[PDB]
Paper text:
Unlike HUWE1, RNF146 and TRIP12 which each possess only one WWE domain, the DTX subfamily is characterized by a tandem-WWE arrangement. In general, the binding of ADPr and ATP to DTX1 was found to be very weak, with affinities of 709 μM and 659 μM, respectively. To visualize the interactions of ATP with the WWE domains, we solved the crystal structures of TRIP12 and DTX1 in complex with ATP. The DTX1-ATP structure has one ATP molecule in the WWE1 domain while WWE2 is unbound, a trend observed with our DTX1-ADP structures. The ATP molecule binds the same way as ADP in the DTX1-ADP structures, with the terminal phosphate group of ATP having no interactions with the protein residues. Taken together, the two ATP co-crystal structures provide a detailed characterization of TRIP12 and DTX1 interaction with ATP and show that the interaction with the ADP moiety of ATP is preserved. A superposition of this structure with our ATP bound structures highlights the conservation of ATP binding to the proteins, with the exception of the terminal phosphate group, which adopts different conformations based on the residues in the interacting loop.
Numbering used by the authors: 20 to 184
């Protein structure tokens, strides 16, 4: 039998959290992997801001060209009914005015709460002292009460592949 699953490539950050690459980058990574299992993904070819980084598919690590520092990467899978299967992305605004995507597990949970018409979502069970309020469209830190704008966009869907069973 065949089952469909959404591919989300993730890289491990300094806070030990798996961060998603954007859908555009994930399609490029999958295309390189389909050509060669031990290839190198030059992320600068698809996103100028990621010009320092290369994904070494042989070792499954992202490395910075100028420093040699390595970060583990993973070809993760999510359900096709989840946000990345359609291209839905939830993002929060930093002090500088830039928008950052939530970690994929949190993005999926926010979208699931939003479509079930829940007024809010407490992320404390996931290990995050924050509340997402949908009527005001803002995130609030539970301990300090600081608010940040949030938004949803319809970007590109992440790659979707078949798993054989
Ligand atoms: N793919 C990526 N997308 C976005 N930010 C990234 C990516 N890879 C790493 N970063 C971030 O870049 C910053 C610097 O880490 P990087 O892996 O580039 O090099 P480094 O050698 O660890 O840097 P340094 O030791 O000088 O801080 C960190 O905040 C890290 O989370």
């Amino acid at each position: 039998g065949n089952v469909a699953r959404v591919v989300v490539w993730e890289w491990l950050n300094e806070h030990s959290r798996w961060r998603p690459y954007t859908a555009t980058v994930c399609h490029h990574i999958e295309n390189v992997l389909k050509e060669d299992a031990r290839g190198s993904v030059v992320l600068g070819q698809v996103d100028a801001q990621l010009v320092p980084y290369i994904i070494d598919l042989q070792s499954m690590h992202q490395f910075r060209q100028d420093t040699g520092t390595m970060r583990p990467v993973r070809r993760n899978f999510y359900d096709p009914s989840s946000a990345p299967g359609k291209g839905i992305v939830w993002e929060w605004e930093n002090d500088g005015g830039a928008w950052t995507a939530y970690d994929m597990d949190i993005c999926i949970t926010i979208q699931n709460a939003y479509e079930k018409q829940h007024p809010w979502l407490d992320l404390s069970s996931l290990g995050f002292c924050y509340l997402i309020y949908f009527n005001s469209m803002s995130q609030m830190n539970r301990q300090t009460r600081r608010r940040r704008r949030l938004r949803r966009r319809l970007d590109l869907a992440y790659p979707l592949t078949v798993g054989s069973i």
